[model samples]
Target chain A: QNKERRQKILTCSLDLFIEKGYYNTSIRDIIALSEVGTGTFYNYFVDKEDILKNLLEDFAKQIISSISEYYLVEKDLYERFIETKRLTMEVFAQNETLSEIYSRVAGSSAPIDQCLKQFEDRLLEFYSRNIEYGIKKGVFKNVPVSPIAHSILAIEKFSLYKWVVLKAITKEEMIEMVLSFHKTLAVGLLVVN
Target chain B: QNKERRQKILTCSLDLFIEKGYYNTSIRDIIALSEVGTGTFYNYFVDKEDILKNLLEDFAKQIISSISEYYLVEKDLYERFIETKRLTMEVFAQNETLSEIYSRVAGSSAPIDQCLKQFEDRLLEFYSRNIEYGIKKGVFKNVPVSPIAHSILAIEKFSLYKWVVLKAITKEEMIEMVLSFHKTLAVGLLVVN
Candidate 1:
């Protein structure tokens, strides 16, 4: 019941924040909208920024879990790579508002920086491991896997930034562009002969 | 002489805005730092945001001119494509602070939306013409040029967004990664026969 109440508060606060923006939304507004007493709100979180930090940490964990689950289902390294990309887009599409807030938090200078940095490091590590697996399976040609990993992750990260930050492409268009870019990259990096 | 003084004010304001952010800086700060009278400031610009709008318009013009200068140096479609990518990264690298300001303005809910939209349209039209030239020259495989052009622009724009907004890659790494991606894209788009 306590966990359920905390989740409820988070959802309501996120809606308010999205509508009013982080700076404009106040703690009173959050408490009033969430139906949580001031003490109860502070009991679960440190402060307003803490709410955002927790929201992002939870969100990042959910995305990372989904990616891991998707990867687990694919035995082929190349398919794993593709599915990871697809699952990432699907996650963002499912939670567009949350993703936008995440982008805002990621770009801002705050304590959330450490959390976002860890998330990025984990993402790059995942990509590097997959690239190594592909090479071992004779799917990808031998190359500097770390830089290749960075490049692959960079493409996906930039695609999301375009959709979430720049609003340059539609969700559908972003997914399509990323998938196409991934396909082209796979072809270029893999052994043809 | 008045126009020159206004230009000086604009330049100084841009430098300050880039350093302290638009929201943090004030009209008084601008006037005091630029040594322009409040009356003169309003005579030349309506307000702070107006000055930013002017700055962006001028920046867009500079980008257009730089792109045109690159196109003028090459006639071969493939060579033009590669050189344009190089030139885009080079220019973006040189204007790091301006690039950050660009990302901020582009992402924000500013009054410059229409101006940015026009800039984007012109930019896409320029790239579309180059893609068409490539198709006619048999340098590019006969793909739908508009989508291809959009993809090309998306790649560069998103790549820069990552570097500027996310600060994920260093300036040098961004240039190299973008160049590598461009090479891969060129190979994928070019006719094999």
Candidate 2:
């Protein structure tokens, strides 16, 4: 299958997955929407889960790229630490489909859990690297970076899950809560005079 | 029909749920091990989910009582804040069955999610009240108590899920990570000189 055809199937699957849910969506629905032959579809993707894994991978890349792109211009580490969360939440808030799909699928199944874990590990690594940089530069306190990084990712995941999956909190509340938590977290991270 | 019979069923079901997994364990299995009649089981509980719900409620009560009992003795606000987490984690770590069951069922279904949410809300309320007490006592800074409370609960749930369900981290690692996260969080929360 060509790149265009493969991309079409992925795009169609994402919409269906969000609309009908991952469990409700089927291979036939994906292929019908994509307007592709079953043979071509099989060549491009192995299964519905394969497509989801692909989507999650793409989703992770989009989020990481947005932050790194912002990272290039923002020189202040403090601003970077705070702004990155704002930027990340904005990405989730804007991408309603992937955010919904990701939140719904989290803790749903083992294979899917693996996919979520991979995405989380990448985000945690990004957080740790940023924190370590601040520490090396004498900006952040030399505390245990791992737990802080883990907590940062945990709050992000939890807040997004609350907004997207649980519908317990509003979009604005999600961003506000995450930003507020991080602002407080940043104080502990920063070196005192 | 009696409290002893109901308690027997509850105890049996807890072991089965953890051993066979909730979805895999059937009502027959619960009744079989409980040594209770089918009529007796129905008289006390509506269904398997109902039993799970009951267990979760009891689980929540146990955790809250443990913390509150400790609260009576710990006079220092800062020590209370830090030690409460350690005490809570110990409760979870020691109660392997309920912890495993809770972690597995989280995000699995709507009703179960509601059960989990109620338990979490109770914990969050407990945390917020404690934080508020510290603020009023002038030992902790006046921060966004809601977000901090939410984040504190988020980290605890996330860390437990990581340990019990994912098994990605060990028991000791779970406690260490939670305590470390809170210690760093405490710095930002304390009233600076």
Candidate 3:
């Protein structure tokens, strides 16, 4: 039940979930992989689904933190959107485990609907801020803030959703698809100089 | 049970599901509202989920057929994109009960995922073909076909999902939001005059 024990269960469960998938993996697998007792796993987590939810929440925080760091070094308004997408794709595509976590949770529901909505709101807030900045600079149109903000986030989420869940394209293809779509969004959604 | 009886069950459930949502409404509730016996209900559906999926699929086909008929009448590319969206919103918003059907079904899964994907592809094709026509007519930018096609569809679908689920905007506002975004898309995502 210590912090280190909790992290070990999470790490082990993440690897198994990615390797075997959400439906395929089990709690026994986590205890075995993490080299922890079943009692310890139970002590730290409510259940297998609980661990996965924890990881998804963790992933969101990590993505938000990483994007802020990237945004600081990048200045151009248009390029901000592109890199914002690139950094997210890079995180999910970083490994099978992360992408595995993503495909399971990105649009998941029932048990995690409240958690999912919070993540959705966080992305909306972060993207809305960047968009408002562009709108004031006259680089983007003075459109309604919320819908436009969701459109921006949806483009990235859809790109990754298709890439990881649907496998409509490889990760690189997803990145390209988003960038090209961003190009049109840049032209169509953003205002011209 | 005859088709009319089955259809009656579906219509009743549609309203109940929309009014109270999926979980709160139950099989006993469905039977009572539709005034069908439990035997009749069991004969028609495996469970509550089955009826909802059936109604959702029926709605998709109805929407697709209607949009195609509407598309046949509209000609201009920019106008084509705009009317296509308007036609969809009109169908959803024509009745509160019907728009309620839309809000419930747009992003459904499991029993409805396969049915949903087919609807998505049809929308993709309907929208993509418009983009292609615009490309040749020098209306939409000759961007790659698939992603832009999805962007077009996603913009509308995501907008409706939020408008309905989030209950964030009026249906009138939802239509206007898509139109305004489409205008930006027309300017930035599509080729400029």
Clashes of each: 0, 0, 5
Instruction: Tell me which residue pairs clash in candidate 1.
Output: none
Q: Which digits, one per residue and each the tens of the lDDT, describe model 3 over residues A8-95?
A: 8888887786677665688888888888887767877877767766766777787788888987788877778677877877876765
For candidate 2, write residues B8-124 as lDDT tens digits: 998899899877878789999998899888887898887888898788778778878988898788798778877888888998888888887776666656777777788888888
What TM-score should be assigned to candidate 2? Answer: 0.90
Best model number under DockQ: 2
Question: What is the DockQ ranking, best to worst?
Answer: 2, 3, 1
Reference contacts preserved by each model? 0.06, 0.37, 0.31
The sequence of per-residue lDDT tens digits that candidate 3 reaches over residues B1-193 is 4889999998888778777866578888889998989887888897876775576567666767877787677775566667777877776665456445544443333444454556567667866766777778766666787778777666666666556655656788888877776666666622332
Q: Encode model 1's per-residue lDDT on B1-193: one tens digit a residue.
A: 9879889888888888878876688888899998978898888887777787676667657766887786666675656666777787777777777666665555445354444556556767877787676667666655555545555565566567667877777777777766665565565311221
Top candidate on lDDT is 2
Docking class of 1: incorrect
Pick by DockQ: 2 or 3, better one? 2
Q: What's the CA error at residue A30 for candidate 3, in Å?
A: 7.8
> Model 3 chain A, poorest ten-residue lDDT window?
A103-112
Segments in model 3 whose C-alpha atoms lie over 4 Å from true places: A1-3, A12-54, A95-111, A189-193, B1-6, B9-58, B68-74, B93-111, B166-173, B189-193
Worst 10 residues of 2 chain A by lDDT: A184-193
Reference-based TM-score, model 1 = 0.76
Off by over 4 Å in 1: A26-32, A35-44, A72-84, A103-106, A110-115, A141-170, A184-193, B1-3, B26-50, B74-83, B110-124, B143-169, B188-193
Q: Between prediction 1 and prediction 3, which has the larger DockQ?
A: 3
